[PDB]
Each structure stands twice: as C-alpha cells, then as structure tokens.
Design a protein around this ligand. Structure first.
Ligand SMILES: Cc1cc2nc3c(=O)[nH]c(=O)nc-3n(C[C@H](O)[C@H](O)[C@H](O)COP(=O)(O)OP(=O)(O)OC[C@H]3O[C@@H](n4cnc5c(N)ncnc54)[C@H](O)[C@@H]3O)c2cc1C
Ligand SMILES: NC(=O)c1ccc[n+]([C@@H]2O[C@H](COP(=O)([O-])OP(=O)(O)OC[C@H]3O[C@@H](n4cnc5c(N)ncnc54)[C@H](OP(=O)(O)O)[C@@H]3O)[C@@H](O)[C@H]2O)c1
Ligand code: NA
Ligand code: NA
Ligand code: NA
Length: 529
C-alpha cells in the first residue's frame, strides 16, 4: 500500500492540470512537489522586466473548462508574466489545489521498487514517501544554463540568470549588461533599455526577430473571441503549431515575387513569430528556397529599421531561419537608442568577467552594476538527468539516454513502469498549453484504466520506444530544424549530445498518435495485473 496513489513533480501549467485530473476527476490521493516558493513554473521564476507570452493571450491558457474560458478576462494581446502567474494562481484557487501542492520542496531521488511495484520519492529536506504512479512535469525549459565564463564568480554587482530574476532588483538608472539574444534576452532588452542608464548587449548569435503586434485588447474583441472559443480550440487542436491562426497551405515558390513580398509584409504587420514562419507559406521550415525568401525579408527590415550600418550588420543573421521563431515589440528599434550598445561576441568574445564588469578580447572593460544571463536552459532532459531517477534493475535514467533522451509518445519510458512525463523528450513542439492538455488527459485515462482493471504496472516496451525514436528522427530530418544550432537539438550546452528531442509532426498528428495507441489496446505497453 503506497503513501499516495500518485506523486506529481512540478507546479507549472503541467503539474497543476495533472493534479486536478488525478485528484478532482479520478479521486486519487495525490501530492505535487515544487522546488519553487510559489506555483506557476516558468511564470513564477521569470520575473524579469519584459517577460511575456509569445503565443497571443487568447490561446495561452487552458481550454478544458468552458466556464473558465467564459469568465477569465485578459487586457493585452500578449500576456505579461504577472498576468500569466495570476491566471495560474486563479486556476489553483478555482480547483482547491494549493492544499496538495508542497512548495520549496525539490525532489532529489525517485526510485522504482520492483518487489513492491511502488515509486519512492526523496526530498532535499530528507523526507521519503511512496506512490503507485509518478508524473514528472519538470519543464522543457526549467533547468537554468549559466555558462562557465572565466572570472564569472568575481563580479561584485548583481549577477542573475533571467530564470532567477529577483523581485527586489530595480535596474532603473543602472549600467546593465545582458548575455544572450533568444526570446528571453530580446524581450528583456526591449524593456531594460527603457529603464537602464546604459544597456550593453553581448550577442554571440543574432536571430531573425519579427514584430509581436502587441498592444491593448478591445474588450468587445475579447467578448467576440469568447463567443467563438469552441471553433478556436477545435482549429488549435487540429493545427500543427496550435497558435490560433490558420496555417498556410501555399508553397512559397508557387506564387510570384510580388505575392511573396505581400504575404510576408501582411504577416509582419499583423505580428507573431509562428505566424511569420507558418502563417505565410507551408514550407518555410522545409524548403531551403522558401527559407531563403523568408530570411531575406527579415534582413531587409533590419536594414530599414537600424540607423547605424555597423549595428544593422551585427544584428543581421546569415544562417537558416530555423531556430524557434522570435517576436517582440520594437526590438530592432531599441538599437537606435543612445543608451544601448551591441557587442558581437563573434568579433570581440568575452575574455574575463571582473569585479566591475566584463572585459572583451579588444581589452574594453564594460563597466556594469548588473550582469544578466539570458543564456537559456539545459532543455528537455536537464531536470531528469539531475535527479537520482532509477528504474528496473536500479539503472539511472542516464544509462538509458547515452545517445540522447528518449520516450514512448513523449509521455512514457521503457524501464520506468508507472512513470508518466508531461513534455518528456520526443513530444510535440507547439503552443504549450494544448500539448500539455493532450498529454495530461491521455495519462489520466491510462492511470484510470490501471485503477479500474487492478493493474500493478503500465510500461512501454524497449521496441516501442525505439520505433518512436525512429518516427521522430524521420520527421525531424524532413525539416531544416536540425540545421539550426539551438537548445532544440541540445547543441547549446558544451558536451551535450546533439539529438532529436521533439516530435515535429504537430499537435493534430500528435493527438492522433495518442488516440490511435489508446484505441488499439495501448499498442507498445505491457499491462500487468
Ligand atoms: C518568459 C517565457 C515566456 C514563454 N512564453 C511562451 C509562450 O507564449 N508560448 C509557449 O508555447 N511557450 C512559452 N514559454 C515556454 C514555457 O515553458 C511553457 O509555455 C510552459 O509554461 C511550461 O510549463 P510546464 O509546466 O511544462 O513547465 P515549467 O513551467 O517549467 O514548470 C516545471 C516546474 O517543475 C519544477 N521542478 C523541476 N524539477 C523539480 C524537482 N526535481 N523537484 C521539484 N520541482 C521541480 C520547476 O521548479 C518548475 O517550476 C515561455 C517561457 C518563458 C520563460
Ligand atoms: N516571449 C516569450 O514567449 C519567450 C520568452 C522567454 C523564452 N521563450 C521560450 O524559452 C526558450 C529559450 O529562450 P531563451 O532566450 O531563454 O534561451 P535560448 O533561446 O537558448 O537563448 C540563449 C542565448 O544565450 C546565448 N548564449 C548561450 N551560451 C552562451 C555563452 N556561453 N556565451 C555567450 N552567449 C551564450 C545564446 O547564443 P547562441 O545562439 O550562440 O547559443 C543565445 O543567444 C525560447 O526558445 C522559447 O521557447 C519565449
Ligand atoms: Na499573482
Ligand atoms: Na552597460
Ligand atoms: Na535548434
């Protein structure tokens, strides 16, 4: 007999919904452990100025409760971090979840006992307890990456990762430096430039940024959206990327030069990064000729916006437009400000961090009060590999993942009976909440099957997981995504295996894969009584 039916790790979008399904819908005994001082995952940690959704707010939310969709108001096209946090806090209150979420509690160990067929979980605080079912909602983008830059520990000012932004820190009138120009660094740069006396950007790799088109929402437009939510969510769940817009079915090079320009400009005017990549033409990320046309359009905008030609050059990427799409309000314009400087780490790498700032290879000491690491995450597997996470034969998860992280269907792991992952490796790459709903709902159904039928273990076969890896590889290799160095294939962390870590077939196809496996008697699972 376990202490609980189920333990859930993480209280972001993923663990919040998982706890709701298992406790409120299935009536099981459940606890969430969250290492943070508050619920909300991403939206708890990322307190930095300019932190916001790059999915439009109308579909950056749960869908599963039709009344919550009718009730809950948003006021801006994209959701600022405090607004997302307030929404998730509202969900926790609405479903009476806080009593079963244990905060400030890091899980250090999770060990499967093959004799008892129970999971034993150990906390940093030195408590252990057992559950039949373990759900890991640890976050794809949760484990902070802070590079080992020479002299980093000598800096005498405030040095923080974006994912550790402190509530107290006011950068107004300070000299601020930021390392990184992904989605986090770039939205930070736009907000920080308005506050800091001087902002120095340390850019290793420029990315292709498009407008967000952010601004206030017409309360009548919010009302109209709520009246059409059913069709909106149907289009989301059927789509590839689930961002709430109709994906193009047109091949970029099937139309005239004049029409490509018009389509690209219309998407640029409306905003959104996923709109620019998938709302224009159907083959931006698959056809190198289409990819070149999209990239060229973005480079031409950089040249128009940025007044200093050297600054324009350092901002202009020349690589494939196949990193996750970025958007911002006023990003390139920010470099026209007198108080903003751009260091290309390609031309002048960091030599040393010193007490007073950052010295680049040109010998310049960039004097800073604050140094911000917008350096991203040990993405997908980082919080798994950091855990003493052991399956059958007492093997650590690392023993299984020597060629990169693997799963069956993104949610289960061979060797790890009764363990379910929310956004485990080799799952969908979409607007996050609807992918979380597809996984939580499916995991809920399989756990309930196990309860109703008296199963002791649910586990995928080694063969099934290997076939899933090959399915993910084939789809990935039909795209340009593997030929862009980013966190998505593990290439951002020195020493990390370069490997497929997502199913890139989209939400519609992914939901079908889950449904087909469930309807076919859980094809690839051993169900033991
Ligand atoms: C500023 C920002 C904006 C974003 N905007 C968007 C967007 O608009 N659209 C989009 O699609 N995605 C967006 N993302 C991606 C985002 O990760 C997801 O949208 C979503 O919030 C992920 O929720 P999750 O529950 O899967 O993970 P997380 O929110 O990362 O929650 C995981 C939690 O698990 C906890 N945890 C991990 N390991 C342990 C352990 N061992 N013990 C205890 N607790 C543990 C962590 O502390 C964390 O709170 C954004 C990310 C950032 C940083
Ligand atoms: N607006 C939003 O909704 C939003 C905001 C936050 C983040 N996100 C989500 O979170 C993901 C992660 O974004 P992120 O910006 O946190 O991380 P990221 O995309 O991994 O960007 C990390 C940045 O740091 C740089 N960097 C890494 N190591 C470095 C080093 N040793 N020296 C110098 N520079 C270094 C990288 O340069 P290289 O390219 O050279 O490695 C890159 O510019 C996004 O892709 C998205 O899914 C979106
Ligand atoms: Na709040
Ligand atoms: Na500065
Ligand atoms: Na990548």
């Amino acid at each position: 007999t376990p202490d609980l039916d189920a333990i859930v790790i993480g209280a972001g979008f993923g663990g919040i919904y998982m706890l709701h399904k298992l406790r409120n819908d299935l009536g099981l005994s459940v606890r969430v452990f969250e290492k943070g001082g508050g619920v909300g995952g991403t939206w708890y940690w990322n307190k930095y100025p300019g932190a916001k959704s790059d999915t439009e707010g109308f579909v950056y939310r749960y869908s599963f409760d039709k009344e919550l969709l009718r009730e809950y108001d948003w006021t801006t096209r994209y959701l600022d971090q405090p607004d997302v946090l307030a929404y998730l806090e509202h969900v926790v209150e609405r479903y009476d979840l806080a009593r079963d979420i244990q905060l400030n509690t890091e899980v250090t160990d999770a060990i499967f006992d093959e004799e008892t067929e129970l999971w034993r979980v150990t906390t940093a605080g030195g408590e252990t307890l057992t559950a039949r079912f373990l759900v890991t909602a640890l976050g794809l983008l949760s484990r902070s990456n802070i590079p080992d830059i020479p002299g980093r520990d000598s800096f005498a000012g405030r040095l923080v990762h974006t994912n550790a932004w402190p509530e107290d820190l006011d950068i107004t009138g300070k000299r601020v430096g930021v390392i990184g120009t992904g989605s986090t660094g770039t939205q930070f740069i736009v907000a920080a430039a308005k506050m800091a006396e001087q902002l120095t950007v340390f850019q290793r790799t420029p990315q292709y940024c498009v407008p967000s088109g952010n601004g206030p929402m017409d309360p009548d437009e919010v009302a109209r959206i709520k009246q059409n939510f059913d069709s909106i969510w149907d289009q989301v769940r059927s789509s590839t990327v689930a961002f709430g817009f109709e994906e193009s079915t047109v091949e970029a090079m099937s139309v005239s030069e004049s029409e490509r320009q018009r389509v690209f400009q219309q998407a640029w005017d409306k905003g959104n990064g996923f709109r620019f990549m998938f709302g224009t033409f159907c083959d931006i990320a698959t056809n190198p000729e289409a990819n070149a046309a999209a990239a060229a359009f973005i480079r031409s905008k950089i040249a128009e916006i940025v007044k200093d030609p050297e600054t324009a050059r350092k901002l202009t990427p020349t690589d494939l437009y196949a990193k996750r799409p970025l958007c911002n309000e006023g990003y390139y314009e920010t470099y026209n400000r007198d108080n903003v400087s751009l260091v290309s780490l390609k031309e002048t790498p960091i030599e040393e961090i010193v007490p007073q700032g950052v010295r680049t290879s040109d010998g310049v000491v960039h004097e800073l009060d604050v140094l911000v690491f917008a350096t991203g995450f040990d993405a997908v597997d980082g919080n798994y590999r950091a855990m003493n996470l052991r399956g059958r034969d007492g093997r650590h998860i690392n023993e299984h993942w020597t060629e990169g992280p693997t799963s069956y269907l993104g949610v289960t792991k061979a060797g790890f009976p009764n363990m379910f992952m929310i956004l485990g490796p080799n799952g969908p790459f979409t607007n996050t909440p609807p992918s979380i709903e597809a996984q939580v709902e499916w995991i809920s159904d399989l756990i309930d099957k196990a309860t109703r039928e008296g199963l002791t273990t649910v586990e995928p076969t080694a063969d099934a997981e290997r076939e899933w890896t090959e399915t993910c590889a084939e789809i990935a290799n039909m795209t340009l995504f593997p030929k862009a160095d980013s966190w998505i294939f593990g290439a951002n962390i020195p020493g990390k295996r370069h490997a497929v870590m997502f199913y890139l077939g989209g939400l519609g196809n992914y939901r079908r894969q889950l449904a087909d496996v469930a309807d076919g008697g859980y094809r690839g699972f051993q169900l033991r009584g």
